[PDB]
Structure 1
């Protein structure tokens, strides 16, 4: 990835984008839980941004999954 304009409108704020992407990247770095999109030698953080742009990752989704496993 080079620019992050596509991710701005997906999470409108450009800072909540940063923290949400950091949440997903931390999940994908040591919290296992491989990315849902293929990687191209990309770091975990860029994969998080990529999936955010793909729309399949958002703060709501992360919270839903965290709550679901916290019920376990």
Structure 2
């Protein structure tokens, strides 16, 4: 279990849009449209999204780039 979220709030200092980006990621993960970029250890999708945020792989801009890439991909 993630006993502290200190690194995630240190990544984005607002501490609120952190929740939004993590919700977007965990929503792409739950409804199985996407796949986790980190090897899961039988964690649920919330702690997976926090673990992804704390490693610097995912933020809002990465979400935006991946969404627009998927949009143009399915557009063709």
TM-score scaled by length of structure 2: 0.87
- Give the Cα–Cα distance (whole angstroms) in 1 for the partners of residues 48 and 66 of structure 2: 18
**1:22-42 alpha-carbon deviations (Å, 9 max, x no partner):** 100000111431110011211
Q: Could you list the runs of 4 or more consecutive aligned residues of structure 1 that deviate by over 4 angstroms after TM superposition?
A: none
Structure 2 equivalent of residue 22 of structure 1:
23
Structure 2 spans left out of the alignment, 5+ residues = none
Structure 2 equivalent of residue 44 of structure 1:
45
Specify the structure having the higher radius of gyration (Cα): 2
Structure 1 spans left out of the alignment, 5+ residues = none
